Structure 1
Amino acid sequence: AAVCDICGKGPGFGKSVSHSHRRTSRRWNPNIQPVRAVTRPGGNKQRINACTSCIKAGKVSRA
């Protein structure tokens, strides 16, 4: 739950602000889920972490 193995999108770091205008540390992590990639026509897939961006763009096929 860190980075997409394909596009390598790492998490970004920022500062969270309360309604009292006081600052504090917080982190944002890109949406990535475990899916079996469709790359070989042979009909075999392997467990690889992927990101919604790559999945929806189809860089790893759906089948």
Structure 2
Amino acid sequence: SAHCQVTGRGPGFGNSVSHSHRRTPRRWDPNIQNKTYYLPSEGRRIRLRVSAKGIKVIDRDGIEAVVARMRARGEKY
């Protein structure tokens, strides 16, 4: 995928099941979405690819904080 942006919750690769096994993965994706937000600092609307988890992070942490944390990682937002 375009890859998460605030955390880095990438995929994973499972395998087997019950009822006798069979070996066979099925990526365990993450739940990213395309929520947008508003930066009152620079007067702008930003769209991101963020999981619901990361939305939780935002609403109990801020957006400025998050973009600074992403600036660190230098994601091409």
Determine if the TM-score, normalized by the shorter chain, exceeds 0.5: yes
SS at match of 1:53: helix
> What stretches of structure 1 of length at least 5 have no aligned partner?
none
Distance 1:3 1:16 in 2: 25
TM-score, normalising length: structure 1: 0.69
Flag as ranges the 4+ runs of structure 1 deviating above 4 A.
none
CA contact (8 A) 2:14 2:24 kept: no
The sequence identity of aligned pairs, in percent, is 48
Q: How big is the shift at 1:54?
A: 0.8
Distance 1:17 1:11 in 2: 19
User: Relative to total residues, which structure has the larger strand share, 1 or 2?
Assistant: 1
- The one of the two structures with greater contact order (alpha-carbon pairs below 8 A, sep at least 6) is 1
> What stretches of structure 2 of length at least 5 have no aligned partner?
64-77
User: Relative to total residues, which structure has the larger helix share, 1 or 2?
Assistant: 2
CA contact (8 A) 1:37 1:60 kept: no
